[PDB]
Design a protein around this ligand. Sequence first.
Ligand SMILES: O=P(O)(O)O[C@@H]1[C@@H](OP(=O)(O)O)[C@H](OP(=O)(O)O)[C@H](O)[C@H](OP(=O)(O)O)[C@H]1OP(=O)(O)O
Length: 122
Amino acid sequence: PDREGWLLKLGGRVKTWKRRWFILTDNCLYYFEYTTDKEPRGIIPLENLSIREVEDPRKPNCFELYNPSHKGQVIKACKTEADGRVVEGNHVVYRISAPSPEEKEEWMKSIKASISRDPFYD
Ligand SMILES: O=P(O)(O)O[C@@H]1[C@@H](OP(=O)(O)O)[C@H](OP(=O)(O)O)[C@H](O)[C@H](OP(=O)(O)O)[C@H]1OP(=O)(O)O
């Protein structure tokens, strides 16, 4: 309460990938820069979002997080700036890459189960 591990994340404004430790708990995805950090770098509520496999030109074992009900809106999420101050995220989509084909399978299964497990999923 359900899965943890390293994954790569593509930046919002522009590109550049970053390695972050992710924690799937309470239908939310928390991420940190280092496993020893005391406070979250960000929080992404999973409710009302979907996940799809994608083919990135360079990074293998990828998938994306997006909002199927509001094309064009920024995904509601929290993140901390360099100075530590909290602000809203600016992602319309989140692209992620896993460490191995098996782990990608594991993460997509866990995320889908988490989302569908919600009483409001329908
Ligand atoms: O542009 P943003 O939408 O603010 O995304 C930002 C990125 O900004 P850019 O893509 O414009 O370079 C950051 O890149 P950098 O470390 O080079 O500043 C980083 O990639 C950060 O990642 P980090 O918060 O894990 O450090 C993202 O924040 P997110 O958490 O929202 O992805």
